[PDB]
């Protein structure tokens, strides 16, 4: 594993490498890793996602861009404007994260008030889905 670590306000993050017999999660928590659908067959997307203790939901990246990550492992972009912030909440300051990791999660549409104001009779169907096995 490549590891990136940073404390708020520090001038630079620490980059390290770890290795071992198993992914760095306790055996008691090993059963709650999420397995993504992965519609993109190219090497540009992850297979699994895990949220450990003291994780971060609201994140900012290097002009800056704001992103919101769901427990299901999907990421959504948020407008920088006062309206979008005040309407969702998200007034607190976001934590920092590296683009080389954050880009590996699947992306949804941005949460802009300008495009939520629409009506529909029926919605489009989703191509290339995956089987839910019981």
């Amino acid at each position: 594993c490549w590891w990136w670590e940073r404390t708020a306000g520090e001038n630079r993050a620490r980059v390290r490498v770890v290795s071992g017999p198993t992914i760095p999660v306790a055996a008691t928590e090993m059963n709650k890793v999420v397995s993504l659908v992965k519609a993109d067959t190219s090497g540009r997307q992850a297979d699994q996602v895990y949220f450990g203790p003291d994780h971060a939901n609201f994140v900012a990246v290097t002009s800056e861009s704001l992103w919101w990550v769901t427990d299901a492992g999907a990421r959504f972009g948020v407008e920088d404007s006062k309206e979008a912030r005040d309407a969702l909440g998200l007034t607190l300051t976001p934590s920092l994260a590296p683009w080389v990791a954050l880009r590996l999660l699947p992306q949804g549409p941005t949460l802009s008030r300008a495009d939520a104001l629409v009506e529909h009779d029926t919605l489009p169907m989703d191509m290339t889905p995956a089987e839910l096995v019981v």
């Binding site: 059963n31 890793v33 299901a72 839910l132």
Partner: protein, 137 residues
Amino acid sequence: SFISPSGQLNESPIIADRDSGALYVRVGDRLYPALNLASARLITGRPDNPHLVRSSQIATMPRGPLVGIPGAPSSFSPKSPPASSWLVCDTVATQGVTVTVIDGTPDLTGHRQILSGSDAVVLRYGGDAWVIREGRR
């Protein structure tokens, strides 16, 4: 504490976050977020309704991606009336029309009337003129 302890989970397979109102479905040992109640029922196989559960409990069970049919109906309440009634209506502006569908019994009060007897009306379609009477054109 003895009348209702914390460990009494898994009472039904369709649960809703008591705080956020979000809807989840249980399959195997994981919880999957469902798009709507119609698809939650079909996946589970039970004609039940969501059971409200405290948000602190659902955070302890493994997740899964979204499941269901997008845009399906969100509530069911079958009804059976004594008689079935439908109307298709045309109303003309004063070069322009609108079409209305009515389901249920109509309101015949006021100047509204059935077109019985010698009553008639004349309208245009494709250049031709059509006379309406005896329920035919």
